[PDB]
Amino acid sequence: MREWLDILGNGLLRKKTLVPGPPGSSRPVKGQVVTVHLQTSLENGTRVQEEPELVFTLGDCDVIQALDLSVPLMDVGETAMVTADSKYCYGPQGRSPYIPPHAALCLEVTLKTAVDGPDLE
C-alpha cells in the first residue's frame, strides 16, 4: 500500500525491507566487515546469476551504488528486495552476457553477519 521504502528521493534505489533485523541484532556504524547474500534476478523473468557470499568493508569503493547508499541503514538479519536503476547497478558497465545493458533488475539483499574485522591466519 502506497509504494516502496526509498533511500534516494523520487525512485531509483527502491529497497522494500520485508524482514527488518530483530531487537539486539541492529544496524552497523561505518567501519565493519559486513556480509550479505545477494541473489540477482531479472526485471521480466527469474534468477540470472545466484552468488550467495559477498564479504566487503562498510562504505568503500567495492560494491555497486544500490548497495553502498542503503548499506549503513541495514538492520542485522534482514530480507529486502532492491529494485535498482541500470546506471546505479551492474547493467551497461556490469557483468555481460548474463546481466544486460538497460532495464532496472531486482536483487534481494539478505544480511547474514555484521562482524568488526575477523582475524584468522
- Residues making up the binding site for Ca(2+): 60, 62
Joined grid coordinates for residue 65 = 551504488
Distance (Å, whole) CA 41 – CA 107: 6
For the chain, the first-to-last Cα distance in angstroms comes to 50
Give the up-direction half-sphere exposure of residue 15: CA atoms within 13 A in the CB hemisphere: 22
**Pairwise CA distance, residues 6 & 3, whole Å:** 9
User: Which residue in this structure is represented by grid cell 547497478?
Assistant: 89
CA distance 108 to 10: 21
Q: Is the bond leading into 97 cis (omega within 30 degrees of zero)?
A: yes
- Please, what's the largest Cα pairwise distance for the chain? 50
Binding residue numbers = 60, 62
The number of residues making up the chain comes to 121
Of 71, 64, 67, 65, nearest in space to 28 by CA: 71
Query: What is the dotted CATH code of the domain comprising 1-121?
Result: 3.10.50.40
Per domain, the residue ranges of the chain are 1-121
